Every structure is written in C-alpha cells, then in structure tokens.
Ligand binder design. Structure first.
Ligand code: DMP
Lengths: 99, 99
C-alpha cells in the first residue's frame, strides 16, 4: 500500500485472531500492541519512550495482517494506548520511506 | 531519498542552528524534540504516549533540515528522549510508506 502523509497510515491489523487499528510507526523498532489476548511465547520487558516506560511481552512469530497482507512479526504486548507497526513489521511488508 | 535498508531511518537534523539525531517517527503526527533552544513563538502542549504524558513546546515554522534537506515544520520541544520527526515533517519531504 502507498501511504502519502495527509492522513494516518492506520490499518485493521489481525494479530492473535484479533483486529485493532494499528499505527504504522517507523519511529519504533518493533510492533508494540495495547494489552490483549495473545497466545504464544513471549518475554516480559519494559520499553521507555515518551512520558515513561511501560511493560510488554515480546511475542516473536505472530501473524499480523496489515491492510490484508500477511506479515508475521514480534508484537510486544503491553499497556500501550495504541498499536505500533515498527521496523520489525516494516521489514515484513517491505516498506520503503521515499521522500 | 528512497530508504529500504530495513534499518532505523535516522538523520542528523538541524533545528534552531543546532544538530541532534532524528528518528523518522511516522507513528507520531508532528516533530517532537528533546529540550533545546527555539525561537520565541511557541505554544505549550502535552503529549500522552508510551509510559506517561510529557510537556513540550509546539514551535511552528522551524527550519529543520533532514539529511541535508532544508525543511520547516512544527518542532515540539519538551523532555522527550529523542528528536521525533512525525508526519508534520513527512509532508515537507514528501515521504511515502510504500510496502
Ligand atoms: O512513546 C512513543 N514512542 C515510544 C516507543 C518506544 C518503543 C517502541 C517499540 O520499539 C515503540 C514506541 C515512540 C517515540 C519514541 C521513541 C523512542 C524514544 C522516545 C520516543 C513512537 O515512535 C511514537 O510513534 C509514539 C507511539 C505512541 C503514540 C501514541 C500513543 C501511544 C504510543 N510515542 C509517543 C508519542 C506521542 C506523540 C507524539 C507526537 O505526535 C510522538 C510520540
């Protein structure tokens, strides 16, 4: 998908048989995702960005469908108020930041 | 520039005659930036992202250079641990997320 910039590149991603609005964030390095029900192996950790640091669950190997395009990746599930398709997923769909 | 080196698209940016590392944050909507010196003509705003809410200074019309590309935009100055380049600047360099 080609996303210009006059709007947000949000996409109903499908992770853990679930569906939520995602926020393509080339700023983050992985795919964080508000807490939710996600079965699979995960590692507990804490990301520190703006405002403070939260807790997450590095879920490596999760099929996240972005815009209808299959894309597995590591989804860090934590108490984040949003979804973040970071580099770990911008490399699965083969994104290119051209300007 | 077309950047497909599946890596952090960072760029030495020049803001207020200064220089810091910028993290192309297509996830954010504007160009936040750690504390620094800007031209009187800003407005206080609070961003609430991961971990908590921080306070910045929405500076408008700041010649922020990205990778040597003269660009002006809204640079928020606050206690952020990074130079965030949100869409507000991804619209100046005509960025496009093709995947
Ligand atoms: O905390 C944010 N992280 C933190 C973060 C850390 C680690 C990961 C996983 O690797 C993902 C995100 C990033 C910006 C950042 C990176 C590094 C250091 C400091 C900041 C992100 O790249 C940005 O997109 C939003 C994500 C977001 C947006 C809305 C709601 C929740 C989360 N934020 C917060 C943010 C909010 C507003 C603006 C201005 O509009 C900018 C940033």
């Amino acid at each position: 998908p080609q996303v210009t910039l006059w709007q947000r590149p949000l996409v109903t991603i499908k992770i853990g048989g679930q569906l939520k609005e995602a926020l393509l964030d080339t700023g983050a390095d992985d795919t964080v995702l508000e807490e939710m029900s996600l079965p699979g192996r995960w590692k507990p950790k804490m990301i520190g960005g703006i405002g403070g640091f939260i807790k997450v669950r590095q879920y490596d190997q999760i099929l996240i469908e972005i815009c209808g395009h299959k894309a597995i990746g590591t989804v860090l599930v934590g108490p984040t108020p949003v979804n973040i398709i970071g580099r770990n997923l911008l490399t699965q769909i083969g994104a290119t930041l051209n300007f």
